[PDB]
């Protein structure tokens, strides 16, 4: 019996999901990053930018989904977390107790990331009143977040949405105007693809942008509509609806971008532009990786990013309910991020997937440009060819360090002091580097 | 005759008549109960507001699963109400 | 200490106490294929049938974009690259550099 | 029987085989760092890896017999 | 014929009187053929059966959901019949049963989304302006139900279209009745619409009718209850016609005003609640001495909720609000009303949680000395809730003297059974503690005074009172008196009145729990034999109480009593596990553990009479086998095991089942000698051996879980496995759960490696087997199977290699 | 030591007198091996793709001089799911004048170490601390913790560290409940957990 006792010395510093909001309840704003199992809260400095870490907490599990909301009239954002086991939690912050108060749990499925068990994709309504969990199979559950007069969160029964032989690429709910709430999904059938001896249903089968409806009064989930897409789709933004801007989703996909409201809405396409003097293979397309809704009381502009480090300021144009132009305009060139957030007074938190983590202050607002704006209204059969360019808008405030992904570590002494240093070769692509690690006080 | 109902579980808590109080639900154990029991919302209505889950009497006390069915992970299935047919 | 590609493995020199870095990428171009590729594409922009009354190559051969921040010209499916380097950990500077074949990558 | 992945006395090697493929890919998507392994292994981005996996959800092992 | 469709609509009788195949399948018949059938005989046959008042709970739950399931589809054939269905469901919305009310909400909700809104409006047109209060009543609540079905802005232009029309006071009264019933039914989610609804219902506050002032401001109240608690600014125009109406009018509409104002600041800001509280307060003073019960409900609610704002100052509450309050709102005529009893109680309590303790009780100190029973019950509950919420850290000297003089003073004259003096004085002494130094022989001397006599009804309440004053008498530093009523209670062991007898015994338990076992005034060697004959009784109070007394004495003074008497305690407590009370069996198990710690495993034996149930002896073997280490009783069971004979081996297997079932984790070093014992057990002899011994495989397999033991269990597993091909369903079921335990302890890998052999064997009989085991493997923890899949190399037509498991850095 | 990609480590002895490669020991448990660093003549400290650190000892019954893959085996002494991917193991001594420590770095940028003990009394002390700390303080996201480390394999002979180091973070009434449940004062408990880090790892406190 030679038992062993685990311990740790340096926590994992890889950001995978960054949502944000007001968890202090105050005017100030904090960023829930998420590591592999180490949930962590931060705070920027509004005067010199030093991100002072405040709380870090192990969860000993698998963090698979992470969405914040706020109930009607409240001022304290919450967090929902999806688990590896078939139980969903809801958290809440405590500025004096300095911990996460649990609120409520529901039991709906088995443990372990199966197929038919939910917990994979998590849909929240933008009014906080409904929430939906959804696997990559038939089980999709919808909860209702009622608040009583006792200032707590009276959750409801689960709502069944069983449906044999479907897939799901993605689910984000729709900014509807105080109605029976609407949930979007990029389904895909395969029961066609399970009988053909020739096997042509691996072709000729495409996404439907099916919408889902809760019924508050009658306590059942019914489906709204179903319309075929054309090309296969990655992630979707909800366009801010309500009384400011129309209500839709804009489907990023293979080389195109496509608004599609339900209704009598005609659907704009606009292609993603390519760099001047490429040095690549023209076989590979270009899709997106992240999306950042900048909702202001007066207006809104997006900032999404390509594969190759290009932020796009999509300035949406529309009618009261119709849509007019999805015109495009690049913002600048930063290193690659997997999720990022925009903070008030103009902070941008570029959170890379590899290496360091960045934090940019927006120095120049608005549209003050000399390189031309693009459109969908232009006739072209030729895509838009734009210029790559140095850092012009943003400024780098501080460089938050990280070490991931550590590939090959050796512990040895290659100097003339006692302590064995830690030579780690780690990095990604041309950003990789060799790092000397020591352990003393912060010189 | 006696068979489990096996549907989705809500926020409903089961009850037990005091003659059959100490048991578990499925494996009929007695040892180390430390867990809560949820039941469905369709069989919890009307004449059934407080009722023994197993035999059908005036329920005075809750239902617990044994820790054996928790480590075994059987509770995640459908609603465990025995139904006559 | 800065590098070029994704370092797979390295070893210690025992005698002089130095480091032997080997660097390997899938989907990459090496230095020579980048160079003659850029010049050949410059020729392909002279081939566009029009006054060739002014040149883009005067500024186009000037700046190689730093691959540190300006991304990387990713291509191919069976493309490879390989770079081997010696480095001194006391100061910053490098000792020797070896570059290799296009489709032959060090392990 | 109603649970997906239940075998019985007539299920064949193609059915069992494509089942263990499909929940294999759901497990690959299910983790959080094996995707970082595949993204470091062949040089891509994580969204590209996720999309390639989701596209190879209905393709693989081709047409059935007969 | 459609009467033919009534003849096939005897399938309704097949539905209501049905098996789950008749209900599911017949449900699919009519719900798959609804629009095919039609609309007339539907209600002709559904309608009077719904009308029959002898319908039951689950029967009516059938006879609402069936209308839901066939009203999936019909959308426009109800349009002539909306009026008829509404006239039949004129009742069933305001009636007695909550179940009936919510079923009415469901059926008219589903018909409301089923039909068209304009058809609902022009169909429910002639019922706004009838004469009858009851049809405006049920009609306006029907408007609330269909409003909760189709949402708020669908109704808002019609609400504006009625609330301003000058045609009938019945009609305007009806519209505001609709708004209130919408607020009560919907409740929670009318916060963003609330400013709009205020701008509908705001101009009913300056109108000629006392009715419309009444139901209008009353509807403002029943909305702000749903708005509670924010600080919202959607109430702006509401302030002024209320503020005029207070000094303007007098009456039941002023009950409707102050009701609204109480519902209007649980949320408003500190300055607004300050200035407006000062504004209301003078007219409220003016309206204190009004007599009526409703009036005291209202202004008592008003001071409760205007006191509820944190911004209100305790200087103003204490010095300004309270002296007319305690001056005017106390009669000894306050007895019979539970509404103003409990409301006066809760109101003064919620005063005290903000204002303090010693002032509130110090204004009812001299009030204690009364000839009035329910009055003294009221102030008893008052002082007890204040001390139970705030305590005695505020309560001080020159108060406490008259306090204890008050409590013992009224305590001297007490006849009828009340709980507030016992729970009362219990919480009082919970706040007193050691602080009552110079008084205690008066307290306990008065206790003995009430204890000498009085038909046990205050010997029970006083006896309970010792049982909740014991801990102070530990912390008192006086040691003789509790010895004195100690021996007085030591006399007190003979009575045929068991409900009181449990209080004497529980007083004995709380005394013995806290009394110093060194220098016990009583001799326990004569206490315990006088304590023995109680435990052949019938009643659960004295049984549990006396068993617990045995366990506290055994828990503490174990250096005293003869093991002969302990032995008679053991055998006497053996048979008490077969009771029907979980508290009895809880006590019997724990204290049985302590007396089994007193004697132990050594003298006690196993071969106890060819006898019946013996599960109490089995659990006795389990609890002894835990409370000392089973190193004695496991080879002792081996001596009970090594006999070649029938009728015994099954019994010792069952003792193994409850045995490992009980211990689990501490029987990890005691598995080895069980293994050849489980070899002669697990070898192929008999059904009970295979079945129960397989259950022992399961329970052992769950006790060892993550605890450093596998290869033993694999050597078990190789003997477990060939037992699968057996025909009896119970024993194959125990084989199934046996393999599930071997799954969770051994792991998925070795299960699957002993599984894959004959998966594809050409024979259906062995295939049903190996597939069935494979499914039972497969449901449990499929996600662990990812690494443990055997890799199979590819054929010509398809790719079988996951290269994802084969990438190399 | 052969690092087979599906099967586990394979022990090979070479005949210097004969020029022949000999496989004599194997495993029944297929693990997706990445890396290893050895400690002695008989234990092999491996890794995995998914995150299972494993160490297998050679039994001293293994005949060194021989000629599924072998009837003889080598038994597991440890299985401990981490949850990330481990890449470079190296047994060393981090502070001067210290002890042995099997450092695991991992893929997500973290650094983990491992620990040998002193006594069964210390070990059953920490084990009872686990017994009560699990159910008497559950994890945050509701993951059944023994079923989390016991994900693929049954866990064998490891004490978790960070589960047992929440005594610096729980509520003081539960510090009373647990510290008085094991009859020990919280300065004794917290001083005992200071001693491990000041012994092996980078802790800085001066006696
Ligand atoms: C056809 C024939 C009939 O079926 C016939 C057999 C039937 O009529 C008999 C049934 C009959 C009367 O014998 C039933 C006896 C039942 C008992 C004695 C059970 O009583 C209880 O369940 C009461 C309550 O639920 C549990 C009390 C308790 C907690 O002490 C219990 O023992 C335990 O489960 N423990 C106590 C110990 N605790 C710790 C945690 C620490 C470590 C060592 C392990 C245990 C774990 C939980 C008793 C079970 C009795 C079997
Ligand atoms: Zn049910
Ligand atoms: Zn019962
Ligand atoms: Zn159970």
Numbering used by the authors:
A (entry chain A): 0 to 380, 383 to 444
B (entry chain D): 7 to 91
C (entry chain A): 779 to 829, 834 to 889
D (entry chain B): 16 to 81
E (entry chain C): 490 to 1098, 1105 to 1304
F (entry chain A): 1001 to 1067, 1083 to 1222
From the paper:
SF3B1 is a central component of the SF3b subcomplex in the U2 small nuclear RNP (snRNP) and plays a pivotal role in the early stages of spliceosome assembly and branch point adenosine (BPA) recognition. SF3B1 is intimately associated with three other proteins: PHF5A, SF3B3, and SF3B5. SF3B1 is composed of some 20 HEAT repeats that form a superhelical spiral of one turn that wraps around PHF5A. SF3B1, part of the U2 small nuclear RNP (snRNP), is targeted by splicing modulators, including E7107, the first to enter clinical trials, and, more recently, H3B-8800.
Here, we present the cryogenic electron microscopy (cryo-EM) structure of the SF3b subcomplex (SF3B1, SF3B3, PHF5A, and SF3B5) bound to E7107 at 3.95 Å. The cryo-EM map shows that E7107 binds at the interface of SF3B1 and PHF5A. SF3B1 encircles PHF5A and, at the interface of the HEAT repeats 15–17, forms a deep channel from the top to the bottom face, where the BPA binds. E7107 fills this channel like a plug. Residues V1110, V1114, L1066, and V1078 from SF3B1 and residue Y36 from PHF5A make interactions with the compound. The macrocycle is positioned in part by the interactions with positive-charged residues R1074, R1075, and K1071 of SF3B1 at the periphery of the channel. The cycloheptyl-piperazine is sandwiched between SF3B1Y1157 and PH5AR38. SF3B1R1074H and PHF5AY36C mutations confer the strongest levels of resistance (>500-fold). Both residues sit deep in the binding pocket on orthogonal sides and are situated adjacent to the diene tail of E7107. Our cryo-EM structure bound to E7107 shows that SF3B1 closely resembles the open conformation. Moreover, superposition of our E7107-bound structure with the RNA-bound structure from Bact shows that the diene tail region of E7107 would clash with the BPA.
